[PDB]
């Protein structure tokens, strides 16, 4: 029968990221934009994230992104 497919970012979650301006204040940090840009070019996304769960700047911006997409 039917199954879940929720491992893709939705149009409503995309809208809530781009229209939230408090998120943009966190992304304007030059240390965040460099690590976000290097992340997508990496071949091991899970291995890259496991280096940033330990970082107090990258954890705080991730926590705000992860709140914004859960607050649908």
């Amino acid at each position: 029968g039917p199954h879940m497919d929720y491992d893709m970012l939705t149009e409503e979650q995309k809208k809530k990221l781009k229209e939230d301006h408090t998120l943009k204040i966190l992304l304007k940090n030059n240390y965040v934009r460099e690590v976000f840009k290097q992340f997508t070019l990496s071949n091991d996304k899970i291995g890259y994230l496991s280096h940033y769960i330990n970082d107090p700047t990258i954890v705080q911006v991730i926590d705000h992104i992860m709140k914004t997409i859960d607050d649908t």
Binding site: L17, K28, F36, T40, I65
Partner: peptide, 25 residues
């Protein structure tokens, strides 16, 4: 668990970077 949380996180990184949220130019 971390592995279910990361799948939503990484598709947010890949959207934010493609639309260049931090770059006004």
């Amino acid at each position: 668990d971390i592995y279910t949380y990361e799948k939503k996180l990484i598709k947010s990184i890949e959207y934010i970077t493609k639309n260049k949220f931090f770059d006004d130019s």
